[PDB]
């Protein structure tokens, strides 16, 4: 508040009295007569630097960057190693860019949902969520933030006919629409892996969104993908080629140490 500490009518007793020259309260037959006011120190006073409401809370970020990153998160959604490292029990799915028939957009019952993931071997990540359901550590319990748990996989569809109301109730699962992707759901926490599940109709039309190398988007009006700075990263394969090895000196592995001077005389 703007008025926290300026309800009073305090005034300093001057010098000549053995007190320490701050404002003090006017008169009375109370405790709070000549106590202390108007200051970060004094009990009942005001905070230092009242927190104002015209702080700068928000941020702008350039569009091309946000599109780049969206492209990056999808890439590492493949590359099993990164998914493993992000903690997703994944070692039984048959293929990592995981894709299914476009029939599942028409399911309506959670039993159809659950039965499916069992077959595709994605239920072990879900059990892992249930295990994680625990309680929070701090004052966030008073503030409507009382429980916490992991994040589970993510399903990406194009056309809705009731898929949402099937997967709505299962915990840790979030639904996305390919036309309106979000970084805050593909890279939760700031890191980059997440176990995502696709459909056919969604998966096919990615070429039309973010373009290939040769052509461009046709749904973004000007966006060609980012270009690589370093094509071949196979560093060991490079340095072990003959071409470079011919163009090298010899190494020198022998090692020389602190010799002890002895006296010739």
């Amino acid at each position: 508040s703007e008025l926290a500490g300026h309800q009073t009518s305090a005034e300093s007793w001057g010098t000549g009295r053995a007190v320490a020259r701050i404002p003090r309260v006017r008169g009375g037959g109370t405790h709070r007569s000549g106590q202390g006011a108007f200051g970060n120190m004094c009990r009942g006073g005001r905070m230092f630097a009242p927190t104002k409401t015209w702080r700068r809370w928000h941020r702008r970020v350039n569009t091309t960057q946000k599109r780049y990153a969206i492209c990056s998160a999808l890439a590492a959604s493949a590359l099993p190693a990164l998914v493993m490292s992000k903690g997703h029990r994944i070692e039984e799915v048959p293929e990592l860019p995981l894709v299914v028939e476009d029939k599942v957009e028409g399911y309506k019952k959670t039993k159809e949902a659950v039965l499916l993931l069992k077959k595709l071997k994605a239920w072990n990540d879900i059990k892992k969520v249930y295990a994680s359901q625990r309680m929070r550590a701090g004052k966030g319990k008073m503030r409507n933030r009382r429980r916490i748990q992991r994040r589970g996989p993510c399903v990406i569809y194009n056309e809705d006919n009731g898929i949402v109301k099937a997967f709505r109730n299962i915990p840790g699962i979030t639904l996305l629409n390919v036309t309106k992707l979000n970084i805050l759901k593909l890279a939760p926490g700031g890191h980059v892996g997440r176990f995502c599940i696709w459909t056919e109709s969604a998966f096919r039309k990615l070429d039309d969104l973010y373009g290939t190398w040769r052509k461009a988007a046709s749904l973004k009006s000007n966006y060609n993908l980012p270009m690589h700075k370093m094509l071949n990263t196979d560093l060991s394969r490079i340095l072990k080629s003959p071409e470079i090895q011919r163009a090298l000196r010899a190494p020198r592995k022998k090692i020389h140490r602190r010799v002890l001077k002895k006296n010739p005389l």
Partner: protein
Amino acid sequence: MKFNPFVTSDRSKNRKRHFNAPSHIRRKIMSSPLSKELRQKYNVRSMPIRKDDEVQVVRGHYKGQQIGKVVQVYRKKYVIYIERVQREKANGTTVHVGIHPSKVVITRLKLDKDRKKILERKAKSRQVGKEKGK
């Protein structure tokens, strides 16, 4: 999950409404379940409790299968008094012991006009619920 924006989902507001509710609401909050037999016949799951209903106790020190009746419904503190559950005080005088009605099972009712009416509305609501969900 919840979707409606005209109600609360907030710890403080629930508790305040609970500990300051009037009596015609405390009645519902002080509800209690049925046994398996009665459920089957009436096709119902819960009714609010009354003053001559026959009941068992399930949890606590005084659980067991001994059956008793209800004596007094002290809504102001969210408890009830059963006839045989009681303890001796220092002097040698018996006194009752309150218990929350969520922890008891009803075996016999105390029927009358209104209470039959009430059961019937519950039955038809569930009935169309099953037949339309199915």
